[PDB]
Design a protein around this ligand. Structure first.
Ligand SMILES: C[C@H](/C=C\C(F)(F)F)Oc1cc(-c2cc(-c3cc(CN(C)C)cs3)cnc2N)ccc1C(N)=O
Length: 253
């Protein structure tokens, strides 16, 4: 369990946080990634907190949660490595940006994939009771699997639920709603320049139908997730009973 067991291929992303690099396990040549963190400038508190968060990621194993592998300490450079699975398809933010740019709507089949696997990711989290549902925290592997990252475990808070906009599992359903919405329409359901304007729109509860290449059923269920009354939003179980969701929309090994 040392850094010498792995070889850096190259950097994927840079912090902020630190650095994110694609790596190769030397023992077998498995492709992984790790997140670089430099704790050299943290108090003992922040370091204890950090060891607390790290112990959390060692707990969750689930086919739709980004899989933790290992933690590596280098007291030499005062650098912490968190090793996880490679998600070659990158994040959803990029897919959404890419579709926005090339003006190409995603396939309903792909939407159903994200809807199905994220819902399962939720049901896992609520059980162990966390992680936030936003396009940047959703990752795609090479097998059409959708995986939830660790974020949350200046910007306009597009995915704020009406309730949390004031003073609840159904709050997550809303955010999921906003996400699939953005995935269909290539833009959030509510947009504004100030947060106050945003809150004005979220409370009115009106938005556009998602594009007509997407079926009525798909739109109905997203619409129901964006209901102002949390009790009218469907449960994880209600979402899965939907005739739209089929075996092939689930995770595969
Ligand atoms: C810091 C990083 C979040 C974004 C960043 F990756 F851009 F930095 O943290 C996580 C990373 C991953 C993760 C991302 C990827 C990516 C692959 C590609 C394109 N390839 C073709 C080169 C762009 S990003 C691959 N595997 C990953 N495990 C997952 C979760 C997190 C997190 N913050 O929990």
């Amino acid at each position: 369990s040392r850094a010498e067991d792995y070889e850096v291929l190259y950097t994927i992303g840079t912090g902020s946080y630190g650095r994110c690099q694609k790596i190769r396990r030397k023992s077998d040549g498995k492709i992984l990634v790790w997140k670089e963190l430099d704790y050299g400038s943290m108090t003992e508190a922040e370091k204890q907190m950090l060891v607390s968060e790290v112990n959390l990621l060692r707990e969750l194993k689930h086919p739709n949660i980004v899989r933790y592998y290992d933690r590596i300490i280098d007291r030499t450079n005062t650098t912490l490595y968190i090793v996880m699975e490679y998600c070659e398809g990158g994040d959803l933010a990029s897919v959404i940006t890419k579709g926005t740019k090339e003006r190409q709507y995603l396939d309903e089949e792909f939407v159903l994939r994200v809807m199905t696997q994220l819902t399962l990711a939720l049901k896992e989290c609520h059980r162990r009771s966390h992680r936030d549902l936003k396009p940047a925290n959703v990752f795609l592997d090479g097998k059409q699997n959708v995986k939830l990252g660790d974020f949350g475990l200046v910007g306009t808070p597009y995915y704020m639920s009406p309730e949390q906009m004031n003073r609840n599992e159904k709050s997550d359903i809303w955010s999921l709603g906003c996400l699939l919405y953005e995935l269909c329409a290539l833009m959030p359901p509510f947009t504004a320049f100030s947060q106050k304007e945003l809150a004005g729109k979220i409370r009115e509860g009106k938005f556009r139908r998602i594009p007509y290449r997407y079926s009525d059923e798909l739109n109905e269920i997203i619409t129901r997730m964006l209901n102002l009354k949390d009790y009218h939003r469907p449960s994880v179980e209600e979402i899965l009973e939907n005739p739209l969701i089929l075996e092939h929309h689930h995770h595969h090994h």
